[PDB]
Amino acid sequence: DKTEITYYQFSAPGKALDEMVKEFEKQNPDIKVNVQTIAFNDYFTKLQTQIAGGDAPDAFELNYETFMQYAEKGVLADLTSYIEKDKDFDPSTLNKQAYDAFKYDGKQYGMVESFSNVVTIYNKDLFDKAGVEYPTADWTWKDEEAAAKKLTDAKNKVWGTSQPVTMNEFYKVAAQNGGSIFNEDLTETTINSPENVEALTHLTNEVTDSKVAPSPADLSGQLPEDLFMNGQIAMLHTGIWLFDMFQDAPFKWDVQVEAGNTQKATHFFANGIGVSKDSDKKEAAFKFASFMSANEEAAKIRIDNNWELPATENKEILQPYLDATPPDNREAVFESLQYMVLPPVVKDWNKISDYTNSEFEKVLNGDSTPEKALKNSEDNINKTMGFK
Numbered sequence: 001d002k003t004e005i006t007y008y009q010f011s012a013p014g015k016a017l018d019e020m021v022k023e024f025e026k027q028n029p030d031i032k033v034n035v036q037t038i039a040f041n042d043y044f045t046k047l048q049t050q051i052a053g054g055d056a057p058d059a060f061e062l063n064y065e066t067f068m069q070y071a072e073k074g075v076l077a078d079l080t081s082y083i084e085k086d087k088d089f090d091p092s093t094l095n096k097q098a099y100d101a102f103k104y105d106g107k108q109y110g111m112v113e114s115f116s117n118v119v120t121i122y123n124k125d126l127f128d129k130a131g132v133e134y135p136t137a138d139w140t141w142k143d144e145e146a147a148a149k150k151l152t153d154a155k156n157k158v159w160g161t162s163q164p165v166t167m168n169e170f171y172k173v174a175a176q177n178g179g180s181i182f183n184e185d186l187t188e189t190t191i192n193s194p195e196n197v198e199a200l201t202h203l204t205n206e207v208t209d210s211k212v213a214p215s216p217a218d219l220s221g222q223l224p225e226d227l228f229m230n231g232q233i234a235m236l237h238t239g240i241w242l243f244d245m246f247q248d249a250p251f252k253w254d255v256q257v258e259a260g261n262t263q264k265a266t267h268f269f270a271n272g273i274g275v276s277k278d279s280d281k282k283e284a285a286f287k288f289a290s291f292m293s294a295n296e297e298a299a300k301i302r303i304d305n306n307w308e309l310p311a312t313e314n315k316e317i318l319q320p321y322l323d324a325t326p327p328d329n330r331e332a333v334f335e336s337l338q339y340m341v342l343p344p345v346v347k348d349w350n351k352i353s354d355y356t357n358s359e360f361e362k363v364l365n366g367d368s369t370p371e372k373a374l375k376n377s378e379d380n381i382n383k384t385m386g387f388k
């Protein structure tokens with residue numbers, strides 16, 4: 001008769017997701033979806049505990065960079081059969097990189113829900129007040145550093161820039177200097193290359209040296225997007241997932257393709273919905289995953305709410321996103337895809353990220369240096385992954 005499934009997720013706060021659930025329930029009168037939301041910072045720890053303790057959600061959200069951990073643990077249902085029998089589902093209409101993110105050992109273990117990237121988001125009022133020209137798509141690091149220096153006004157608690165100094169940010173920033181985290185087959189790390197020391201130093205000196213970016217102490221108890229909303233950051237490197245937050249920013253703002261150094265490199269992220277291997281309700285969970293992936297009404301809701309980008313590439317579905325404002329320069333989101341760098345795909349990503357993030361924080365707090373942080377991170381990766 002009636003089936004009630006659980007869906008565990010992070011990427012929605014609840015307007016858009018609630019409307020998608022309502023539409024799903026209308027179109028699938030025998031299936032009720034009970035949503036549990038966890039903040040991104042705690043989601044994966046919480047999810048793993050739920051699963052390992054024997055009460056996995058029927059369906060749950062995964063990001064690109066945690067997918068392999070789950071796929072390799074065996075907690076996801078193989079969706080091969082479900083997809084074969086979903087006769088009208090046509091994955092050739094989806095973004096291929098986003099769809100492929102949820103494949104493991106040649107099998108689809110998740111349905112792609114959304115994809116996204118990071119841009120430079122800038123406060124035009126601050127730029128105009130200082131007489132600084134806006135970011136361009138052909139800036140290099142030195143143009144943003146010079147802009148950031150002229151836009152910092154220490155007595156008024158205004159910083160020129162803010163960018164995460166984390167493993168997730170660093171695989172991109174390293175690539176902007178021709179560096180990388182792993183070799184092609186994931187058997188060695190080159191995280192401590194000289195170009196990577198320069199790349200990390202570019203980030204950490206903004207906090208510790210030129211003081212154009214707020215430090216951990218300055219951000220204590222808050223997040224950079226909160227300082228940005230408070231008029232205190234001229235340039236913020238963050239995702240398109242914050243465009244909804246920023247609609248009521250009390251200043252004019254716009255976006256630009258991020259600057260590189262030896263080359264451009266931009267983030268590419270994707271979320272997918274997996275079905276628990278142990279669920280008794282896999283058909284219903286799959287129908288919800290499939291809806292979220294490819295249903296046109298879901299895609300239109302997503303677009304209307306600026307909630308990342310839908311998996312579908314259809315131009316009529318995407319047009320309202322290009323026409324929506326703020327920000328005006330919506331084309332920067334799509335221009336950035338030319339320079340994308342995919343997340344490394346390794347089962348220990350979150351664990352190695354935690355260690356590296358602690359090392360990077362120590363540089364920002366004046367307890368370490370970029371070279372020591374990268375040496376320590378190389379050692380920890382080698383031990384964790386057994387590299388020869």
Ligand SMILES: OC[C@H]1O[C@@H]2OC[C@H]3O[C@H](O[C@@H]4[C@@H](O)[C@@H](OC[C@H]5O[C@H](O[C@H]([C@H]2O)[C@@H]1O)[C@H](O)[C@@H](O)[C@@H]5O)O[C@H](CO)[C@H]4O)[C@H](O)[C@@H](O)[C@@H]3O
Pocket residue numbers: 010011012013039040063064065116118164166168169170223224225237238239241267269270271308
């Ligand atoms: O749960 C909603 C939303 O939370 C997070 O967004 C806020 C977060 O953004 C910036 O940090 C991110 C960092 O968390 C990491 O993000 C990768 C992740 O981004 C999206 O998920 C966001 C969270 O980031 C989530 O939807 C995307 O949907 C997901 O697929 C990706 O895995 O890494 C990026 C790059 O370094 C970073 O921008 C911001 O710095 C931070 O302060 C803010 O709290």
